[PDB]
Symmetry: C3
Subunit: 259 residues, 3 copies
C-alpha cells in the first residue's frame, strides 16, 4: 500500500505514521499525496471514529522538500489526488471526523500547520517549533496565518511567525497550540488513548460538534446558532440518542453504533 | 415568586441562585422558563446594573434534565416565554447588561455553556466541568460549539468537547473559561464584589462596551470600528460623562446615574 | 526630536519614544498627530523593516488629554500622510510594530499595545481600562481586540470594572508576550525587532497581510490567497537569496524584493 506512511488500526482509531525517517519526514511529492489519500480514505470509512497522526524516527517533520514539488507550487498545481483531502485543509474542505496530532523533536514550518489543522495536539517534552518560512524568503502558506493568531492570539502568533525564532513545548502549550505535554516518547500513546475516548462517544454527536464549530468560523455566529436546535432534533432521532439517554437514566455504560 | 430560583437584590446587583435541590439543579422546562423570565426582567429593570448567577447546594448544575425536555425538543417548541430571554443567548438576542456566573462543584453540559454565555466567570477551587453531551448521544447545543473554541482556542475546546472528559478549575482557568479561582465557598461573594465594582461604573459606558464588543463578533471589525467614535460622542452628551469628568478633576469617585 | 516624540533609527529599526513625561505621556492633539505622521512615514519608508514604540520617563502613557481634543471628537485627528496609530479607521500598518511598556499603561495605552504585533512589558507595568470609570467607554479598539486576544471573559473582567491588573495577568491573558526585568523592555523589543529585520521583508509583509485578511474578510478569503501569494514570493530576489543560503549553509542578506 503506502510507501511513505505507516498505517495501523486500533479498533475505531486510525493511526498514521509519517514514515521517511532517514529524511526526517520531510514532505516530498509522494508523502504529500499519500497523506492526502489516507485522510480522504479516513473521511469516507464509517468504521473509523478518530485518527492519530505522528512521525516515525527522531522528529515529527523537517517541513517541505521543495525540489520534490518545485514544479507543482510554481505552477499552482494541486497535490491532492482524487479522492484525497488536503491534509492542511485550506482549499475549502475540512475533515468531518476528529484528527489528533502527536509531536516530538523539531516541528518545522508545515509541521506547525499540520498541528494547527487538527483538533487535538499532544507533545512530548522534547518538542520544539519554528516557523522558518520568512527566514527562507517566503511565508507560512499552510494556514498558520489564519489559525495561529486565532489559537494563540495575534501577539503570541506574530512573535513566532515574524521572527522565525524557535519555541519549545512549554511555550506551545502556554499559547494554546499544544493541549498536553507528556514524557519523552509518550505522545503517540497519549494521543491514541484520547482518540479511544472520542471513539466511545456517539459519532454523530462528535460529527455535529465539529460541523457546527466549523460553520461558526466560516459563516459566523448567526449561521451556527440557526443550526443548533435543528441539529439536536435530528440527533434525538438517532438510535444513539435513545441508547445514550437510557444509559444515563439506568446509570449504565452506552455502546454507540453511529446511527 | 419563582419555584426553581432563589432571587435577591443587593442594591444595584441582582443575585440569582439555581435551586432544584432534589434534581441537582438540572434544568427542566420550569427552570429554563423561569431563568428566561428572570433575565428578561433584569434586562428591563434600569435599577439593576449587574447580575450574578450561581447554584444553591452542592453543585452549580447537573445540566439538562434530559426529559422533562427531550419530548418537547423532539417536536420543535421554543422554551423562551413571552417577556423572557434565552439565558444561553443563542437565538439572536443577548443581554444588554453584565452577567457574572459563580460556579462550584459539578458544572455539567449547559452549565459550561451558561458560563460561556456570561461576561465574567468565578470558580471556587472545587469546581469541575464536563461537556457530557456526546456521551449521551447528542452534542453541545447551547453555544459551546461557538464560544468554547473562541475562548480556549480550537484544540483546547475540542479536547473537552469531543471526549466528554472531566476537567478541573485549574484547567478551566488556564484555557480562559474561568477568570479567577478562589477558595472553597467564596465564589458567589467574589462574583458579587466584582458586580458591585461594575455597578459603580457608568452604566451607559458599560452597556456600550458590551454592545460594541458584540457587534464586532456579529458583523466584523469594520462594523464595530464604524460605531466607535459616534458612540463615544453620544456618551459625552450624557449626565454621567460630566459626572465622570468632575471626579477625574477632583480625584474622587463618581456617583453615576445611568444617563 | 519632533516635539512630543523622540525618534531614532537603529539600522532597519525605527524607535519611537513618547516624550511628554511632565504630562505623563498623555496624548494631546499634538502627540496624536505626531505619532500619526511618524507611523505614516514608517509605512512608506522601505528602509524600515520594524518599529518599536515606548514611553520616555516613568510610564508608558496616562491616556488621553481630553481637553486638548474635546472640540474635535465632540473631526479626524489623522493628518495628511498620517495613519491612526490605533488603526481603527479601515487602515493598518503593512509592517510590524512592537510596543514596549513599563509603569502605568492606561486607557489608550492598552489599545496601542492591542493594535501592535508584539508587546513586551517590564515587571513594573500595570494596566487599567479606566474609560467606564469616567463616564465613557473604550473607543480605540479594545472592544474588538481585547476579547479576541484574551477571550471574552478575561477581557470583560477588566473592561467592565476599570480595575487595575498587572504584567503577570496581562501576560496570562495574551496581551503581553514577554515580561522582562525592570527597564529591559525597550532593549528586548529592539532585539526582537532586529530579528524581524533580518527576515525577508516581503515574507514578513505577506504574513501580516494574509493574517489581517483572515480577520477582515474570513478564512476563505485568506485561504484563496495562500498559494498565489507564495507563488509571487517564489519569483522574488529574496526567495532566490533564501534558497541560495539554505543550499550553501550561509545566512542570507535579504533586499526586500
Amino acid at each position: 500500500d503506502y510507501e511513505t506512511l505507516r498505517i495501523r488500526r486500533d479498533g475505531y482509531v486510525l493511526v498514521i505514521g509519517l514514515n521517511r525517517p532517514a529524511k526526517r519526514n520531510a514532505f516530498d511529492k509522494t508523502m504529500l499525496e499519500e497523506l492526502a489519500l489516507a485522510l480522504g480514505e479516513y473521511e469516507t470509512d464509517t468504521d473509523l471514529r478518530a485518527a492519530v497522526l505522528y512521525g516515525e524516527g527522531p522528529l515529527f517533520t523537517a517541513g517541505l522538500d521543495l525540489a520534490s514539488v518545485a514544479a507543482e507550487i510554481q505552477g499552482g498545481a494541486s497535490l491532492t489526488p482524487e479522492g484525497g483531502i488536503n491534509p492542511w485543509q485550506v482549499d475549502g474542505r475540512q475533515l468531518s471526523k476528529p484528527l489528533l496530532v502527536a509531536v516530538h523533536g523539531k516541528v518545522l514550518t508545515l509541521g506547525i500547520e499540520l498541528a494547527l489543522a487538527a483538533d487535538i495536539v499532544i507533545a512530548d517534552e522534547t518538542a520544539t517549533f519554528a516557523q522558518l518560512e520568512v527566514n527562507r524568503g517566503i511565508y507560512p502558506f499552510g494556514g498558520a496565518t489564519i489559525r495561529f493568531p486565532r489559537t494563540a492570539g495575534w501577539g503570541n502568533a506574530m512573535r513566532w511567525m515574524l521572527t522565525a525564532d524557535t519555541f519549545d513545548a512549554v511555550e506551545a502549550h502556554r499559547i494554546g497550540i499544544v493541549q498536553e505535554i507528556v514524557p519523552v516518547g509518550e505522545h503517540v500513546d497519549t494521543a491514541i488513548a484520547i482518540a479511544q475516548t472520542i471513539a466511545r462517544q456517539a459519532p454523530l454527536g462528535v460529527q455535529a460538534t465539529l460541523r457546527n464549530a466549523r460553520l461558526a468560523v466560516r459563516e459566523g455566529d448567526a449561521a451556527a446558532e440557526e443550526q443548533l436546535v435543528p441539529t439536536v432534533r435530528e440527533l434525538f432521532t438517532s438510535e444513539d440518542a435513545t441508547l445514550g439517554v437510557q444509559a444515563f437514566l439506568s446509570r449504565t455504560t452506552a455502546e454507540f453504533v453511529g446511527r
